[PDB]
Each structure stands twice: as structure tokens, then as C-alpha cells.
Amino acid sequence: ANIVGGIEYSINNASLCSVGFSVTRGATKGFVTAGHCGTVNATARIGGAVVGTFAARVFPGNDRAWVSLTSAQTLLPRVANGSSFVTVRGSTEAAVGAAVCRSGRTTGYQCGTITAKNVTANYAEGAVRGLTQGNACMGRGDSGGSWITSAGQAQGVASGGNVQSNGNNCGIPASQRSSLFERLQPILSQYGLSLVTG
């Protein structure tokens, strides 16, 4: 399968999550995603085919993971934006007030601004600290997806937000949205990953 930020993948033929970013580990191909999406060795499928398994993860505390893929997967430096793509150019971290977008299988590509850093989310399983908050909306299934600037600087992977009864926070004003992502930098160093760029 072609690995692009934002697409859907399933975990052990049950839950759905979104691909964060294509990365490598020495000769190993992978993608980073959210830790809550699977447990170590869970099986990831893209369009019904097995593409790899979870190699490591941390959730709760943090919310990160990387899936090691088979050799047949094609890694691309891109993030889905409808029918188009956003090229990943690096991982410079944007500051509070910067504009940012996120891509995922449930709400597609949404943009907003970063509103705060170092936020704590209290999930049913435990607290997750050090999250960056933005006001782009997201929905259930968007978790693990890419957060990136329009300029191509990858920021992190979708963790959670104040989704309403309709499954998203897109029906409430930006001023009221809290959509959190796990910072990419610490994920790449913790696992020794290199981002695929173009």
C-alpha cells in the first residue's frame, strides 16, 4: 500500500486509526501513530491487507507508537488533503499562534491554530501529559493522524479532543474546540526514527 499521512488503517480487524507519518529505522519502514491505537504486536491493515504490526507504544502518560511495515509498503513524504497531498519537508516545531492542519480518516483535512502547549488530557485509562492543543476540529477515528503546517513542517500525531455526541468537535466554534496532538520530536528520538521528506 502507499503510506500517506492521514489514511485509515485498522488494528486487529477492529478499531480504526489514521496514519501519522512515514518514517524509517535503518532499513526498516514504518509509520508513527497514536499509542492508544494498538498494543505491541497488534496487526495493522490498510485496505484489508496486513501492512505491519505495532513495534512499540506508550499510552497513557504519552500517546505514541510506530508500526513496523513489511518491505512491500511504499513510504511517501506526503499527507492526504482531499484528493491532493501536502509534502512533508521537515519537523520544525511551530509556536503558539501558528496555523496548522491535521488529516484523518473521519473528518478529512481541517486547519486551525495552535492554542497551547504542554496540556494534560485525562482519558478513561489515565492522564496523558505534554500535549499541544489546536482548534482544528477532529472526530473519532482521526487519532494517530498527521498534524502539519501548510508549509510542510510535521508537528505530531492526533491524540484526542472534546468530541461531542456526533463524534466530532466540528459542530462547535473554534473558540470552544480542544483538539490535542502528541509532539513528533520526542517520538522520533525515543525510537530512533527518521522522517521521510520530499
Helix (H) or strand (E) holding 167: none
What residue type is 41 in one-letter code?
N
Which listed residue (10, 18, 36, 179) is catalytic?
36
Residues 6+ apart with CB under 8 A from 14: none
Region 77-183: CATH code: 2.40.10.10
Alpha-carbon dihedral sign for residues 98, 99, 104, 107: positive
Fold agreement (3-76+184-196, 77-183): yes
Q: Is 36 a catalytic residue?
A: yes
Q: Tell me which residue of 45, 60, 92 sits closest to 159, measured CA to CA.
A: 60
- State the method: X-ray
Residues 6+ apart with CB under 8 A from 170: 107, 110, 137, 138, 139
What residue type is 138 in one-letter code?
M
- At residue 123, what are phi and psi to the nearest 5 degrees? -95, 165
Grid-cell match 491535521, residue found = 102
| Cα-based torsion angle of the residue sequence 132, 137, 141, 144 in order, rounded to the nearest 10 degrees | -30
Which CATH number applies to 3-76+184-196: 2.40.10.10, 2.40.110.20, 2.170.150.20, 3.30.565.10?
Answer: 2.40.10.10
Which listed residue (18, 22, 63, 142) is catalytic?
63
Query: What is the domain partition of the chain in residue ranges?
Result: 3-76+184-196, 77-183
Which listed residue (103, 143, 159, 179) is catalytic?
143
Half-sphere exposure in the Cβ direction for 59 (13 Å, CA): 25
Q: Which three cell numbers stand for residue 174?
A: 473554534
Specify burial of residue 154 (Cβ count, 10 A radius: 0-12, 13-18, 19+): buried
Resolution of this entry in Å? 2.2
Helix (H) or strand (E) holding 185: helix 184-191
Q: Is 71 a catalytic residue?
A: no
CA distance 177 to 154: 21
CA distance 57 to 184: 13
